[PDB]
């Protein structure tokens, strides 16, 4: 564009000008700097050097891991990390400039496209699953009640991992998966909120000093939350209630004996 400006300045005399001879040099070296065939070649290169097998990695849907950290844990992983960007790369080169793009890579990208959304849903389900497990095991009481749903999620996770590449039955598993983890997540969120209301009452049992009406009110509210727990039944709800009641008895008897002495 700047060259066009100078082409307008003198027409042809700007070329062999007093300083246009140097402008021409700056432009020529800058053209050699601005080259993309090197990048196109490196792209087709790398993709044809190691992404020849990266393309159709759709079979082994699930893959266990190893993560050298404290304890050296292992996670779950689906095999679609750079491939999706390669699909976008091909579409960009084709619509953008258009080359004699390697047709084999284009058709392998096509095969990745026709199975890609499934993998997206699976990957997000896995990530949400991991996030929920983080929240769950960061707590400890919750495990008692979540136990059933957590086993449910892992039941379908086991049924999903066990199979790899089910060309016929894929979509229903994906949808089942999404709803299970979706429910699961809502249950953890729901329970978290419930528990904190419970604990504000529990931790407030030493606040309203010696008023049976208020005590009664607190308890009623707490078990309203307990019927909420009953409906969407969690796992071992009465057991956790036994725990509650024991500590409630202790806060009660403690407030009692304190007031007993004062009275």
């Amino acid at each position: 564009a700047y060259m066009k400006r100078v082409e307008d300045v003198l027409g042809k005399g700007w070329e062999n000008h007093v300083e246009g001879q140097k402008l021409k040099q700056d432009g020529d070296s800058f053209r050699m700097k601005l080259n993309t065939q090197e990048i196109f070649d490196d792209w087709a290169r790398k993709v044809q050097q190691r992404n020849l097998g990266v393309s159709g990695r759709i079979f082994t849907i699930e893959s266990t891991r190893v993560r050298g950290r404290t304890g050296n844990v292992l996670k779950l992983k689906v095999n679609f990390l750079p491939e999706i960007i390669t699909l976008s790369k091909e579409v960009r080169n084709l619509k953008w400039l258009g080359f004699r793009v390697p047709l084999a890579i284009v058709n392998k990208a096509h095969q990745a496209n026709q199975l890609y959304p499934f993998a997206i849903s699976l990957i997000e389900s896995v990530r949400t699953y991991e996030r929920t497990c983080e929240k769950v095991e960061e707590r400890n009481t919750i495990s008692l009640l979540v136990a059933g749903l957590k086993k449910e999620v892992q039941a379908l996770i086991a049924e999903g991992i066990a199979l790899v590449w089910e060309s016929y039955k894929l979509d229903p598993y994906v949808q089942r998966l999404a709803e299970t983890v979706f429910n699961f997540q809502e249950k953890v969120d729901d329970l978290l909120i419930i528990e904190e209301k419970i604990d504000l009452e529990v931790r407030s049992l030493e606040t309203c000093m010696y008023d049976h009406k208020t005590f009664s009110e607190i308890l009623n509210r707490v078990q309203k939350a307990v019927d909420d727990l009953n409906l969407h039944s969690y796992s071992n709800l009465p057991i956790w209630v036994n725990k509650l009641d024991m500590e409630i008895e202790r806060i009660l008897g403690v407030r009692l004996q304190a007031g007993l002495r004062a009275w």
Binding site: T64, V73, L74, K75, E137, S143, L144, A147, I161, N236
Partner: peptide, 21 residues
């Protein structure tokens, strides 16, 4: 007196790894 149910995470995962063959 049931001691109904409770499970793990990492355990189930690597156990399925051994089940992957």
């Amino acid at each position: 007196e049931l001691a109904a149910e409770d499970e793990q995470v990492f355990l189930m995962k690597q156990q399925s790894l051994l089940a992957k063959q």
